[PDB]
Amino acid sequence: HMCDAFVGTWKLVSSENFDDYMKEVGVGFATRKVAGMAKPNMIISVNGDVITIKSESTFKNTEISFILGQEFDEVTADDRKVKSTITLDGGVLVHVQKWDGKSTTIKRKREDDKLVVECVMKGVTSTRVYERA
Ligand SMILES: C[C@H]1C[C@@H]2[C@@H](C[C@]1(O)CC(=O)O)C(C)(C)CCC2(C)C
């Protein structure tokens, strides 16, 4: 019952500061424009100890599965090859990606009826809000 309140299908409703986040990550111009335009559906499910997160959009359809605290290799939608670890910290899903000596942290939390996604790369944060689909 670890992630019950995250499970379901969620649709993007707002984004702020996201182009600047992606710049900080090192995403190139054309990918920033098309990815920034994406309006993903995020599908979160749990089966035993395995969490699956899918992001479906006109840009890319991506899927990760993982166990909390257990690192994995991830290919991001912008083609970074990263080492990822996802944990639950005080009810917040915390996703850290490491690559090329860089690090970004993506936090997902339930707030009211929303799923709020905070994306941080150095001093740049972007806040994205999802609603139930
Ligand atoms: C951290 C951020 C990364 C970002 C994806 C979105 C997202 O995961 C945040 C979110 O879930 O809304 C996106 C736009 C679907 C594809 C391109 C990236 C760079 C991999």
JSON list of C-alpha atoms and ligand atoms in Angstrom, two decimals:
[
{"chain": "A", "resi": 1, "resn": "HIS", "atom": "CA", "xyz": [0.00, 0.00, 0.00]},
{"chain": "A", "resi": 2, "resn": "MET", "atom": "CA", "xyz": [3.25, 2.04, -0.23]},
{"chain": "A", "resi": 3, "resn": "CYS", "atom": "CA", "xyz": [2.21, 4.22, -3.14]},
{"chain": "A", "resi": 4, "resn": "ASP", "atom": "CA", "xyz": [-1.58, 3.88, -3.13]},
{"chain": "A", "resi": 5, "resn": "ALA", "atom": "CA", "xyz": [-2.33, 7.53, -3.53]},
{"chain": "A", "resi": 6, "resn": "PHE", "atom": "CA", "xyz": [-0.02, 7.79, -6.59]},
{"chain": "A", "resi": 7, "resn": "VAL", "atom": "CA", "xyz": [-1.50, 4.86, -8.51]},
{"chain": "A", "resi": 8, "resn": "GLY", "atom": "CA", "xyz": [-3.67, 5.71, -11.49]},
{"chain": "A", "resi": 9, "resn": "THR", "atom": "CA", "xyz": [-3.68, 7.72, -14.71]},
{"chain": "A", "resi": 10, "resn": "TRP", "atom": "CA", "xyz": [-2.76, 11.36, -14.57]},
{"chain": "A", "resi": 11, "resn": "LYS", "atom": "CA", "xyz": [-2.79, 14.13, -17.23]},
{"chain": "A", "resi": 12, "resn": "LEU", "atom": "CA", "xyz": [-0.56, 17.24, -17.34]},
{"chain": "A", "resi": 13, "resn": "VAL", "atom": "CA", "xyz": [-2.42, 20.46, -16.64]},
{"chain": "A", "resi": 14, "resn": "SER", "atom": "CA", "xyz": [0.28, 23.05, -15.99]},
{"chain": "A", "resi": 15, "resn": "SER", "atom": "CA", "xyz": [3.98, 23.60, -16.28]},
{"chain": "A", "resi": 16, "resn": "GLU", "atom": "CA", "xyz": [6.24, 26.44, -15.18]},
{"chain": "A", "resi": 17, "resn": "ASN", "atom": "CA", "xyz": [9.95, 27.10, -15.81]},
{"chain": "A", "resi": 18, "resn": "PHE", "atom": "CA", "xyz": [10.29, 23.85, -17.77]},
{"chain": "A", "resi": 19, "resn": "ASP", "atom": "CA", "xyz": [12.26, 25.11, -20.74]},
{"chain": "A", "resi": 20, "resn": "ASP", "atom": "CA", "xyz": [14.83, 26.52, -18.27]},
{"chain": "A", "resi": 21, "resn": "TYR", "atom": "CA", "xyz": [14.96, 23.20, -16.42]},
{"chain": "A", "resi": 22, "resn": "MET", "atom": "CA", "xyz": [15.60, 21.32, -19.64]},
{"chain": "A", "resi": 23, "resn": "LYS", "atom": "CA", "xyz": [18.30, 23.88, -20.63]},
{"chain": "A", "resi": 24, "resn": "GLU", "atom": "CA", "xyz": [20.04, 23.24, -17.34]},
{"chain": "A", "resi": 25, "resn": "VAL", "atom": "CA", "xyz": [19.81, 19.44, -17.96]},
{"chain": "A", "resi": 26, "resn": "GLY", "atom": "CA", "xyz": [21.48, 19.98, -21.33]},
{"chain": "A", "resi": 27, "resn": "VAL", "atom": "CA", "xyz": [18.54, 19.17, -23.63]},
{"chain": "A", "resi": 28, "resn": "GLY", "atom": "CA", "xyz": [19.00, 20.61, -27.11]},
{"chain": "A", "resi": 29, "resn": "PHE", "atom": "CA", "xyz": [16.81, 23.22, -28.75]},
{"chain": "A", "resi": 30, "resn": "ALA", "atom": "CA", "xyz": [14.59, 21.04, -30.95]},
{"chain": "A", "resi": 31, "resn": "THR", "atom": "CA", "xyz": [14.00, 18.45, -28.25]},
{"chain": "A", "resi": 32, "resn": "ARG", "atom": "CA", "xyz": [13.17, 21.19, -25.75]},
{"chain": "A", "resi": 33, "resn": "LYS", "atom": "CA", "xyz": [10.58, 22.66, -28.07]},
{"chain": "A", "resi": 34, "resn": "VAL", "atom": "CA", "xyz": [8.81, 19.36, -28.85]},
{"chain": "A", "resi": 35, "resn": "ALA", "atom": "CA", "xyz": [9.16, 17.90, -25.34]},
{"chain": "A", "resi": 36, "resn": "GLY", "atom": "CA", "xyz": [8.03, 21.14, -23.78]},
{"chain": "A", "resi": 37, "resn": "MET", "atom": "CA", "xyz": [4.94, 21.02, -25.93]},
{"chain": "A", "resi": 38, "resn": "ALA", "atom": "CA", "xyz": [4.11, 17.49, -24.78]},
{"chain": "A", "resi": 39, "resn": "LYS", "atom": "CA", "xyz": [1.03, 16.95, -22.58]},
{"chain": "A", "resi": 40, "resn": "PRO", "atom": "CA", "xyz": [1.79, 13.57, -21.08]},
{"chain": "A", "resi": 41, "resn": "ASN", "atom": "CA", "xyz": [-0.40, 11.01, -19.47]},
{"chain": "A", "resi": 42, "resn": "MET", "atom": "CA", "xyz": [1.50, 9.50, -16.55]},
{"chain": "A", "resi": 43, "resn": "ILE", "atom": "CA", "xyz": [0.35, 6.00, -15.58]},
{"chain": "A", "resi": 44, "resn": "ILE", "atom": "CA", "xyz": [1.56, 4.71, -12.21]},
{"chain": "A", "resi": 45, "resn": "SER", "atom": "CA", "xyz": [0.98, 1.14, -11.09]},
{"chain": "A", "resi": 46, "resn": "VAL", "atom": "CA", "xyz": [2.25, -1.22, -8.43]},
{"chain": "A", "resi": 47, "resn": "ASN", "atom": "CA", "xyz": [2.54, -5.00, -8.46]},
{"chain": "A", "resi": 48, "resn": "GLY", "atom": "CA", "xyz": [4.12, -6.34, -5.27]},
{"chain": "A", "resi": 49, "resn": "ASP", "atom": "CA", "xyz": [7.33, -4.42, -4.69]},
{"chain": "A", "resi": 50, "resn": "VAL", "atom": "CA", "xyz": [7.62, -3.30, -8.33]},
{"chain": "A", "resi": 51, "resn": "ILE", "atom": "CA", "xyz": [6.45, 0.21, -9.29]},
{"chain": "A", "resi": 52, "resn": "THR", "atom": "CA", "xyz": [5.89, 1.02, -12.99]},
{"chain": "A", "resi": 53, "resn": "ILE", "atom": "CA", "xyz": [5.68, 4.56, -14.29]},
{"chain": "A", "resi": 54, "resn": "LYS", "atom": "CA", "xyz": [4.71, 5.15, -17.91]},
{"chain": "A", "resi": 55, "resn": "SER", "atom": "CA", "xyz": [4.72, 8.55, -19.62]},
{"chain": "A", "resi": 56, "resn": "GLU", "atom": "CA", "xyz": [2.71, 8.66, -22.82]},
{"chain": "A", "resi": 57, "resn": "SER", "atom": "CA", "xyz": [2.66, 11.66, -25.12]},
{"chain": "A", "resi": 58, "resn": "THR", "atom": "CA", "xyz": [2.97, 12.66, -28.76]},
{"chain": "A", "resi": 59, "resn": "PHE", "atom": "CA", "xyz": [6.71, 13.17, -28.08]},
{"chain": "A", "resi": 60, "resn": "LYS", "atom": "CA", "xyz": [7.58, 9.74, -26.66]},
{"chain": "A", "resi": 61, "resn": "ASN", "atom": "CA", "xyz": [6.08, 6.78, -24.83]},
{"chain": "A", "resi": 62, "resn": "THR", "atom": "CA", "xyz": [8.42, 5.73, -22.01]},
{"chain": "A", "resi": 63, "resn": "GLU", "atom": "CA", "xyz": [8.17, 3.15, -19.26]},
{"chain": "A", "resi": 64, "resn": "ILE", "atom": "CA", "xyz": [10.32, 2.47, -16.17]},
{"chain": "A", "resi": 65, "resn": "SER", "atom": "CA", "xyz": [9.90, -0.28, -13.57]},
{"chain": "A", "resi": 66, "resn": "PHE", "atom": "CA", "xyz": [11.82, -0.33, -10.32]},
{"chain": "A", "resi": 67, "resn": "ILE", "atom": "CA", "xyz": [11.98, -1.28, -6.66]},
{"chain": "A", "resi": 68, "resn": "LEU", "atom": "CA", "xyz": [12.32, 1.56, -4.13]},
{"chain": "A", "resi": 69, "resn": "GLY", "atom": "CA", "xyz": [15.92, 2.15, -3.14]},
{"chain": "A", "resi": 70, "resn": "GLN", "atom": "CA", "xyz": [17.35, -0.12, -5.85]},
{"chain": "A", "resi": 71, "resn": "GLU", "atom": "CA", "xyz": [19.33, 1.63, -8.59]},
{"chain": "A", "resi": 72, "resn": "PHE", "atom": "CA", "xyz": [18.62, 1.00, -12.24]},
{"chain": "A", "resi": 73, "resn": "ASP", "atom": "CA", "xyz": [19.89, 2.12, -15.63]},
{"chain": "A", "resi": 74, "resn": "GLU", "atom": "CA", "xyz": [17.39, 4.35, -17.42]},
{"chain": "A", "resi": 75, "resn": "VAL", "atom": "CA", "xyz": [17.33, 5.76, -21.00]},
{"chain": "A", "resi": 76, "resn": "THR", "atom": "CA", "xyz": [15.45, 9.03, -20.70]},
{"chain": "A", "resi": 77, "resn": "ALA", "atom": "CA", "xyz": [13.07, 10.31, -23.40]},
{"chain": "A", "resi": 78, "resn": "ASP", "atom": "CA", "xyz": [15.73, 12.89, -24.42]},
{"chain": "A", "resi": 79, "resn": "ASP", "atom": "CA", "xyz": [18.25, 10.01, -24.82]},
{"chain": "A", "resi": 80, "resn": "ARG", "atom": "CA", "xyz": [20.38, 10.46, -21.68]},
{"chain": "A", "resi": 81, "resn": "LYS", "atom": "CA", "xyz": [21.79, 7.22, -20.26]},
{"chain": "A", "resi": 82, "resn": "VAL", "atom": "CA", "xyz": [21.41, 7.75, -16.49]},
{"chain": "A", "resi": 83, "resn": "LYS", "atom": "CA", "xyz": [21.73, 5.82, -13.23]},
{"chain": "A", "resi": 84, "resn": "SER", "atom": "CA", "xyz": [18.47, 6.27, -11.38]},
{"chain": "A", "resi": 85, "resn": "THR", "atom": "CA", "xyz": [17.31, 5.61, -7.84]},
{"chain": "A", "resi": 86, "resn": "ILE", "atom": "CA", "xyz": [13.73, 6.21, -6.68]},
{"chain": "A", "resi": 87, "resn": "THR", "atom": "CA", "xyz": [12.83, 6.30, -2.98]},
{"chain": "A", "resi": 88, "resn": "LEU", "atom": "CA", "xyz": [9.88, 7.33, -0.84]},
{"chain": "A", "resi": 89, "resn": "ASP", "atom": "CA", "xyz": [10.83, 10.10, 1.60]},
{"chain": "A", "resi": 90, "resn": "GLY", "atom": "CA", "xyz": [8.13, 11.23, 3.89]},
{"chain": "A", "resi": 91, "resn": "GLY", "atom": "CA", "xyz": [5.46, 10.34, 1.38]},
{"chain": "A", "resi": 92, "resn": "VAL", "atom": "CA", "xyz": [7.25, 11.97, -1.58]},
{"chain": "A", "resi": 93, "resn": "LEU", "atom": "CA", "xyz": [8.59, 9.86, -4.48]},
{"chain": "A", "resi": 94, "resn": "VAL", "atom": "CA", "xyz": [12.14, 11.10, -5.04]},
{"chain": "A", "resi": 95, "resn": "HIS", "atom": "CA", "xyz": [13.84, 10.20, -8.35]},
{"chain": "A", "resi": 96, "resn": "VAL", "atom": "CA", "xyz": [17.57, 11.00, -8.63]},
{"chain": "A", "resi": 97, "resn": "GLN", "atom": "CA", "xyz": [19.29, 10.64, -12.03]},
{"chain": "A", "resi": 98, "resn": "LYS", "atom": "CA", "xyz": [23.10, 10.65, -12.32]},
{"chain": "A", "resi": 99, "resn": "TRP", "atom": "CA", "xyz": [25.07, 10.92, -15.59]},
{"chain": "A", "resi": 100, "resn": "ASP", "atom": "CA", "xyz": [28.26, 12.55, -16.82]},
{"chain": "A", "resi": 101, "resn": "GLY", "atom": "CA", "xyz": [29.02, 13.90, -13.35]},
{"chain": "A", "resi": 102, "resn": "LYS", "atom": "CA", "xyz": [25.63, 15.67, -13.29]},
{"chain": "A", "resi": 103, "resn": "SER", "atom": "CA", "xyz": [22.56, 15.07, -11.15]},
{"chain": "A", "resi": 104, "resn": "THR", "atom": "CA", "xyz": [18.87, 15.99, -11.31]},
{"chain": "A", "resi": 105, "resn": "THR", "atom": "CA", "xyz": [16.13, 15.27, -8.78]},
{"chain": "A", "resi": 106, "resn": "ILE", "atom": "CA", "xyz": [12.49, 14.85, -9.65]},
{"chain": "A", "resi": 107, "resn": "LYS", "atom": "CA", "xyz": [9.99, 14.79, -6.77]},
{"chain": "A", "resi": 108, "resn": "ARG", "atom": "CA", "xyz": [6.38, 13.69, -7.06]},
{"chain": "A", "resi": 109, "resn": "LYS", "atom": "CA", "xyz": [3.87, 14.37, -4.34]},
{"chain": "A", "resi": 110, "resn": "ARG", "atom": "CA", "xyz": [0.18, 14.25, -3.79]},
{"chain": "A", "resi": 111, "resn": "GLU", "atom": "CA", "xyz": [-1.29, 17.64, -2.90]},
{"chain": "A", "resi": 112, "resn": "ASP", "atom": "CA", "xyz": [-5.05, 17.95, -2.74]},
{"chain": "A", "resi": 113, "resn": "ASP", "atom": "CA", "xyz": [-6.39, 16.18, -5.89]},
{"chain": "A", "resi": 114, "resn": "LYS", "atom": "CA", "xyz": [-3.18, 16.83, -7.84]},
{"chain": "A", "resi": 115, "resn": "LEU", "atom": "CA", "xyz": [0.08, 15.06, -8.42]},
{"chain": "A", "resi": 116, "resn": "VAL", "atom": "CA", "xyz": [2.78, 17.78, -8.28]},
{"chain": "A", "resi": 117, "resn": "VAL", "atom": "CA", "xyz": [6.10, 17.18, -9.98]},
{"chain": "A", "resi": 118, "resn": "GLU", "atom": "CA", "xyz": [9.12, 19.29, -8.99]},
{"chain": "A", "resi": 119, "resn": "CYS", "atom": "CA", "xyz": [12.11, 19.01, -11.31]},
{"chain": "A", "resi": 120, "resn": "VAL", "atom": "CA", "xyz": [15.39, 20.41, -10.01]},
{"chain": "A", "resi": 121, "resn": "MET", "atom": "CA", "xyz": [18.75, 20.84, -11.80]},
{"chain": "A", "resi": 122, "resn": "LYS", "atom": "CA", "xyz": [21.20, 22.98, -9.89]},
{"chain": "A", "resi": 123, "resn": "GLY", "atom": "CA", "xyz": [19.36, 26.13, -8.90]},
{"chain": "A", "resi": 124, "resn": "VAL", "atom": "CA", "xyz": [16.58, 25.72, -11.49]},
{"chain": "A", "resi": 125, "resn": "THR", "atom": "CA", "xyz": [13.23, 24.23, -10.45]},
{"chain": "A", "resi": 126, "resn": "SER", "atom": "CA", "xyz": [10.25, 23.53, -12.61]},
{"chain": "A", "resi": 127, "resn": "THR", "atom": "CA", "xyz": [6.84, 22.72, -11.25]},
{"chain": "A", "resi": 128, "resn": "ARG", "atom": "CA", "xyz": [4.43, 20.59, -13.27]},
{"chain": "A", "resi": 129, "resn": "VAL", "atom": "CA", "xyz": [0.93, 19.72, -12.10]},
{"chain": "A", "resi": 130, "resn": "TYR", "atom": "CA", "xyz": [-1.08, 16.63, -13.08]},
{"chain": "A", "resi": 131, "resn": "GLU", "atom": "CA", "xyz": [-4.78, 15.90, -12.48]},
{"chain": "A", "resi": 132, "resn": "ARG", "atom": "CA", "xyz": [-6.58, 12.55, -12.57]},
{"chain": "A", "resi": 133, "resn": "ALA", "atom": "CA", "xyz": [-7.41, 11.54, -16.13]},
{"chain": "B", "resi": 1, "resn": "LIG", "atom": "C1", "xyz": [11.57, 15.47, -15.33]},
{"chain": "B", "resi": 1, "resn": "LIG", "atom": "C2", "xyz": [10.89, 15.58, -16.67]},
{"chain": "B", "resi": 1, "resn": "LIG", "atom": "C3", "xyz": [11.82, 15.01, -17.79]},
{"chain": "B", "resi": 1, "resn": "LIG", "atom": "C4", "xyz": [11.24, 15.19, -19.20]},
{"chain": "B", "resi": 1, "resn": "LIG", "atom": "C5", "xyz": [9.84, 14.49, -19.30]},
{"chain": "B", "resi": 1, "resn": "LIG", "atom": "C6", "xyz": [8.93, 15.02, -18.18]},
{"chain": "B", "resi": 1, "resn": "LIG", "atom": "C7", "xyz": [9.53, 14.88, -16.77]},
{"chain": "B", "resi": 1, "resn": "LIG", "atom": "O1", "xyz": [9.68, 13.49, -16.42]},
{"chain": "B", "resi": 1, "resn": "LIG", "atom": "C8", "xyz": [8.57, 15.54, -15.73]},
{"chain": "B", "resi": 1, "resn": "LIG", "atom": "C9", "xyz": [7.14, 15.04, -15.85]},
{"chain": "B", "resi": 1, "resn": "LIG", "atom": "O2", "xyz": [6.91, 13.87, -15.51]},
{"chain": "B", "resi": 1, "resn": "LIG", "atom": "O3", "xyz": [6.24, 15.80, -16.26]},
{"chain": "B", "resi": 1, "resn": "LIG", "atom": "C10", "xyz": [9.19, 14.61, -20.70]},
{"chain": "B", "resi": 1, "resn": "LIG", "atom": "C11", "xyz": [8.75, 16.03, -21.02]},
{"chain": "B", "resi": 1, "resn": "LIG", "atom": "C12", "xyz": [7.95, 13.71, -20.77]},
{"chain": "B", "resi": 1, "resn": "LIG", "atom": "C13", "xyz": [10.21, 14.06, -21.73]},
{"chain": "B", "resi": 1, "resn": "LIG", "atom": "C14", "xyz": [11.55, 14.83, -21.65]},
{"chain": "B", "resi": 1, "resn": "LIG", "atom": "C15", "xyz": [12.29, 14.70, -20.36]},
{"chain": "B", "resi": 1, "resn": "LIG", "atom": "C16", "xyz": [13.47, 15.64, -20.27]},
{"chain": "B", "resi": 1, "resn": "LIG", "atom": "C17", "xyz": [12.72, 13.26, -20.05]}
]
